[PDB]
Design a binder for this molecule. Structure first.
Ligand SMILES: OC[C@H]1O[C@@H](NC(=S)N/N=C/c2cccc(O)c2)[C@H](O)[C@@H](O)[C@@H]1O
Ligand SMILES: OC[C@H]1O[C@@H](NC(=S)N/N=C/c2cccc(O)c2)[C@H](O)[C@@H](O)[C@@H]1O
Ligand SMILES: OC[C@H]1O[C@@H](NC(=S)N/N=C\c2cccc(O)c2)[C@H](O)[C@@H](O)[C@@H]1O
Ligand SMILES: OC[C@H]1O[C@@H](NC(=S)N/N=C\c2cccc(O)c2)[C@H](O)[C@@H](O)[C@@H]1O
Lengths: 810, 810
């Protein structure tokens, strides 16, 4: 039906139909009389995956023959979402499959909804890994994603009595058609034990062994016939493990627990032994695999010419001492040469500045679990600090600040310090973030080795985040400027010459309206909740965190409610305020914020005076597949973190690409977004980084704001008095207390400017034509935020490889 | 190459070749350059399984349309072995696949060796279930096998320093191509909780729930296009299970442990809670599935006309109170009617008379785990004992003997008593065993309800146990009498008219020689052990148990060694004595017996005076796939259990069919084997049941035998003094002590007769022509021992259904 979804030729549709029937029969052992809807999904998934095979084998054969430099992206998170539609899109199969299934009497969109998300990540960091894999394949790089195949991904969120409940995400229950087990590459990983010193160096002995079994998932590039691999490791006990008899077999579970579940913390460090074991497990298995592939090309001088390892935050930081261990203990290279190889191979990306998120492992844990690695880390530290001492003679405080080892109650290893010392490149993920790294938290390191520090502003893939989720918008763009922009997003600048085009303006507004209608329909069918589709869709979706300031949004919502109640018969622009996102299960304040949101909704949504002028909805179970539905439907993107706290954000870029305007602080990539679009076309408010710093020097006093702003005082009194929780008057006492006496994120300080800025949003929305023209200016300048641009920069400035848009033969 | 392996037509071979290449490419994602041998096995398995699909769907559709009476065979064990060759044999695909793989440059027999045994059983009882499924499919019955899909089957046995070591049988590690998950039939199973009494009867509340997910495995009949189902349940936690967060997810393992591992006890009862949970799990899930299928045909009067449930020993005995529970508590039938339905539906097969093997569950366990079932069992007991009291007024001791509840230190429930009371038929598994049940252990029950007691002599499938494992013998038989005997084994009687046929005699002896050569070769390649293929192959393979008297065999072996040493230059018929079998991990005496066997081998096999006249070999890891190799190679089958202890035996029947002669006591099915072949054609020795009874009345004094038999005294002195363990002189003190003072199985009592009988064996073996003629007389009369005969008898005399040899359409 629509052009960007590909051709639906006679021969193709016929073939798809027969292969679908073949799989239903031979693979699923069903006929049409007894086939379940899930059977039909699986038949379609097998039919589509068949099309990957030839390209996958020949891509990997090609790398073996050409022997390019290989890129290894190490991450504990890959937030992939669903695979079916993505695969169809990248193979140009979508229209053909839609036709074939239609002719079989099936609705493809209904079948798509059956697939489980591969929810192997928490939020931004994990989703970035996923967009990166898509871009690396699209740019023809010989790239591999390596991680853990968690049996349970991020929990499913249920809301019960306004409270978050967690349920296990048993995503593999029905089987995963998009993976292929690779038993011949099963590898041993070592834990515990002790170190012996012989005549011929150190030996790590008496270890416990856990096996690492790989599963491969294909990563197709966009219409270039490249299919790269994401290899995820699963933990398996050896067969003689613990080998009364019954108990020994049941105890195999202990070893296999390593790959059982994803830790559900976003921007928070929990120093648990199981997490440390996960981090080593992925590193040890991955490095053996890398070395195997390198030898199957003695001379490790060429190792950095053939291998790049990208560390996604510090989670896989043990790659640095593990590589040293292998090179020194097993290959018998001298220290200095091994170190040279290591530094030239490894690069490190930082994703946060919050002190509580930084990984600082107790020495006693590393001592027991990884005794040889601790020794290696101590040696790295001594040689590094000797360099600092020679560079800054007499600066004893610099020495303690820069040390990999932190003294105190318990000695800890600072993993960020380890990564900087052992990497040739260190990058932040937006210009303001990278500057903050050089000026503040890694200032000492920047002074020692300025050349190591880079910026790589984040991006999102326009395949998933435009073509897939918003085909209507993709189509009206392609009608004017062709299809080339899908892999060259800068071409969207051409849309600037349509800002006065009356046909285009109408088409942009119509696509948004259809998306909103579709999402309003989704909300009634799946959740029995009724919303006005003519209202402004005001959306804040992201993990729940104090720094992201969902609370500031709550204050605005209560302000609007109070104003309506004060002057019931005055016109206001109708809004549907939607907030969604998961809270880490142990994060009490985040759980209270969810309850507050639902409690506000309970009052607002049932007030007869309000009517359909204001609705507050909590979007349950926010995840990639939900993002694909809500983002195209949004009018207003809330990006309101305290300046200096959101390293980049990527949700922000998704909204920009899909025709929502942004209300935001000058934080993370918001700064660069405003720069690209023009500040006139962005709703900027609030303190800048410099203003926050000034307030900190003076001391933040929340009482001052409470005393001088009557509208704010009223809200606080309502919260305290039990207006939003009649049967439990003091329910929100923790929230009020934090706001008044221990708010690290200065919610009150940005309140007045935020409310005023929100008034300007409502004003623009009253003029549909001018709203849409500003939207066009945003979409047209969103090109910089393609992860294709981001990856091309990593390739050229860090990995030392050239991207290629050229097709491999079919 | 050989006729019984089927046609290898041009069109078939071409098709197989292309489907093999298709699976290698699309399914395994490999080409010929990188394909591993395991890849080739999987390609072949997928190619063969494709041929099952149409027949499987249409068989099950046929049952749905015709609505015959369904047979449900409930077992905690199904000892299936490998599936690939069996499937080819039953589909007439063997020659075609052999040709196709040969043309691809592959050896099919090498590929076959890659498949893991499905080792979901311990020995005889589990293997019987497997032969039964094959026969029920071959006889066109609407039959279903129901059991547990254990993650770990019977352990792999390694011998280290002459001792058994156990290793986990991780049989699913690489994936099982012969199963199909059926997620839509996932069912809840309840545990713990408590009973509430309302106005409307009892209610079982506050339970913990575990999910039962079924996996289906096809069971093809022999060339009749019937494919029946074996449905095995796997345990899964519900998603809100235990739902700090991380621990709750890790604790899901506790629920899923139910299906983790097979209990490795053969003929021994271990009263463990995990085992009880396994027994209920299979029963509860199976009964819901049965009822679902029955309703999809309100009136339960017809239930026994449409359903038969066969209980394989008492392991699934909870089916009786579970059926009552469903009918009374859920369907609201009155007690008496529910009971009528239950009795008419259920039948019970007993497989042992050893008191330590009988299931007697502590009441306190049932009280906690299954409180409603305990109540139901008490009610059954009261109503049953009221019938006993009316039938035998004043016989108070009969009342305590017959009670389902046993008083004592801990009160227990006798599950055998439950099964008799709640079943319309009770059978033993050989004529002598069934008679012993009526005369001794169930005498009281037989007097009350004589009509319930039956015999069903065991059998083995001639597909696996002749055509598959011994194609050479199958072929020389088919050359003379055609192919019909494979599903009508009584036709082997026709071979009696060839007992004087010089061509046939030569052919029978040649096939044995080739089998022995092949097995001698297997032993050198896989185990680096050297054996003389001209020797008599003297084989005892079965689980290690005191009752099976591997020890008596050991005594004979030492006798032969001592005689050679006494007169080195006298001629003796050379022998290779092979003993194999697993010991239950907690069974100390059985472990000592294995060590003794290996210790004897250590002395005998390295004595220069002995030469290659005597060799003693322990066959490591005896299992179905090993039985398929060794049984065709055997000359002499050792079946030497103390009279009255082996209920039937089935290994005995396998040896008879494959051209070995039998040395045996008049125990289990040995009696009926001798009756069929003629006692002249069998090597019978030792006490009869009546002789054992006489010895028991008098008191068994082992010292008497020791005092009167000089050759026996010498062996005992050698064992005691450390002749067989120089560095640990007292190693075998436990063994000597047991033999001398607490031998329940009267090893010494049968020693003289056994040795004398073994001399007669050696004498016959010196005359190759007469040895072979006696073999022919055994093979020719082995027909009764087909499990087709056994199943036809269950069908007609217990289940009330007619078998059918008629083909379904292809
Ligand atoms: O069907 C469920 C099972 O599938 C198996 N995949 C097999 S056999 N081929 N895949 C081939 C393949 C081929 C192309 C693309 C692709 O993504 C996969 C996986 O190894 C199992 O872990 C999984 O449970
Ligand atoms: O490939 C490995 C996987 O195979 C799957 N089988 C599927 S998709 N079709 N089978 C179809 C089938 C078809 C005919 C006969 C037969 O015996 C099976 C099983 O459900 C998995 O548990 C297993 O891990
Ligand atoms: O760059 C991609 C995104 O990365 C995010 N970091 C995340 S999700 N975890 N970080 C750190 C972390 C995660 C888990 C444990 C821990 O100790 C630390 C940033 O907050 C975003 O601004 C950014 O857009
Ligand atoms: O009929 C088939 C075969 O059955 C065997 N029984 C076996 S393996 N377990 N029995 C009982 C058992 C098994 C496990 C636990 C338990 O408490 C009892 C008999 O010993 C054989 O003679 C017979 O040929």
């Amino acid at each position: 039906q629509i052009s960007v979804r590909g051709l639906a030729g006679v021969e193709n549709v016929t073939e798809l139909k027969k292969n679908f029937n073949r799989h239903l029969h031979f693979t699923l052992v069903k006929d049409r009389n007894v086939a379940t809807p899930r059977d039909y999904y699986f038949a379609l998934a097998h039919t589509v995956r068949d099309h990957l095979v030839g390209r996958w084998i020949r891509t990997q054969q090609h790398y073996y023959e050409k022997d390019p430099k290989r890129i290894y992206y190490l991450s504990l998170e890959f937030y992939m979402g669903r695979t079916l539609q993505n695969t169809m899109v990248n193979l140009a199969l979508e229209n053909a499959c839609d036709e074939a299934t239609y002719q079989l009497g099936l609705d493809m969109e209904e079948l798509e909804e059956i697939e489980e998300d591969a929810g192997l990540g928490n939020g931004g960091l994990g989703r970035l890994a996923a967009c990166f894999l898509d871009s690396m394949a699209t740019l023809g790089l010989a790239a591999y994603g390596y991680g853990i195949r968690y049996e349970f991904g991020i929990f499913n969120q249920k809301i019960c009595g306004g409270w978050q409940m967690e349920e296990a995400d048993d995503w593999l229950r029905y089987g995963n058609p998009w993976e292929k087990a690779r038993p011949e590459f099963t590898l041993p990983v070592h834990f515990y034990g002790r170190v012996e010193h012989t005549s011929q160096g150190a030996k790590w002995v008496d270890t416990q062994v856990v096996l690492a079994m790989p599963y491969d998932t294909p990563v197709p590039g966009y219409r270039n016939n490249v299919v790269n691999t994401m290899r995820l490791w699963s933990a398996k006990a050896p067969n003689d493990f613990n080998l009364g008899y019954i108990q020994a077999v049941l105890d195999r579970n202990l070893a296999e627990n390593i790959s059982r579940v994803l830790y559900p913390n976003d921007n928070f460090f929990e120093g648990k032994e199981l997490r440390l074991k996960q981090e080593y497990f992925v590193v040890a298995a991955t490095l053996q695999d890398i070395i195997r592939r390198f030898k199957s090309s003695t001379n490790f001088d060429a190792f950095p010419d053939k291998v790049a390892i990208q560390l996604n935050d510090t989670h896989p930081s043990l790659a640095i001492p593990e590589l040293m261990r292998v090179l020194v203990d097993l290959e018998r290279l001298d220290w200095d040469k091994a170190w040279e190889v290591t530094v030239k191979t490894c690069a490190y990306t930082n994703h946060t500045v919050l002190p509580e998120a930084l990984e600082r492992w107790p020495v006693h844990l590393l001592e027991t679990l990884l005794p040889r690695h601790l020794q290696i880390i101590y040696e790295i530290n001594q040689r590094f600090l000797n360099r600092v001492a020679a560079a800054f003679p007499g600066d004893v405080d610099r020495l303690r600040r820069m040390s990999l080892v932190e003294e105190g109650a318990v000695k800890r290893i600072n993993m960020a310090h380890l990564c900087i010392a052992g990497s040739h490149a260190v990058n932040g993920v937006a210009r303001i973030h990278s500057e903050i790294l050089k000026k503040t938290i890694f200032k000492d390191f920047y002074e020692l080795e300025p050349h190591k520090f880079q910026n790589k502003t984040n991006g999102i893939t326009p395949r998933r985040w435009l073509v897939l989720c918003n085909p209507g918008l993709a189509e009206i763009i392609a009608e004017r400027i062709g299809e080339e922009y899908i892999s060259d997003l800068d071409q969207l600048r051409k849309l600037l010459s349509y800002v006065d085009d009356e046909a285009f303006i109408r088409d942009v507004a119509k696509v948004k309206q259809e998306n909103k209608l579709k999402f309003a329909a989704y909300l009634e069918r799946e959740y029995k909740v009724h919303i006005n589709p003519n209202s402004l869709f005001d959306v804040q979706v992201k993990r729940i965190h104090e720094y992201k300031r969902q609370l500031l949004n709550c204050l605005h919502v209560i302000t609007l409610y109070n104003r309506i109640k004060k002057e019931p018969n005055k016109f206001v622009v109708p809004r549907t305020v939607m907030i969604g996102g998961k809270a880490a299960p142990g994060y009490h304040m985040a759980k209270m914020i969810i309850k507050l949101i639902t409690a506000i909704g309970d009052v607002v949504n049932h007030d007869p005076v309000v009517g359909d002028r204001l609705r507050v909805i909590f979007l349950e179970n926010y995840r990639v597949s939900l993002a694909e539905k809500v983002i195209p439907a949004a009018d207003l993107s809330e990006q309101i973190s305290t300046a200096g706290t959101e390293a980049s954000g990527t949700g922000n870029m998704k909204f920009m690409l899909n025709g929502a305007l942004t209300i935001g602080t000058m934080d993370g990539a918001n700064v660069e977004m405003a720069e690209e679009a023009g500040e006139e076309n962005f709703f900027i408010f609030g303190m800048r980084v410099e203003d926050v710093d000034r307030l900190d020097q003076r001391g933040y006093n929340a009482q001052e704001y409470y005393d001088r702003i009557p509208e704010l005082r009223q809200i606080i009194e309502q919260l305290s008095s039990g207006f939003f929780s009649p049967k439990q008057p003091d329910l929100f006492k923790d929230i009020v207390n934090m706001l008044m006496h221990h708010d690290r994120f200065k919610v009150f300080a940005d309140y007045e400017e935020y409310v005023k800025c929100q008034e300007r949003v409502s004003a623009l929305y009253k003029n549909p034509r001018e709203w849409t023209r500003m939207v066009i200016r945003n979409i047209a300048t969103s090109g910089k935020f393609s992860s294709d641009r981001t990856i091309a920069q990593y390739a050229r400035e860090i990995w030392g490889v050239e991207p290629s848009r050229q097709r491999l033969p079919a």
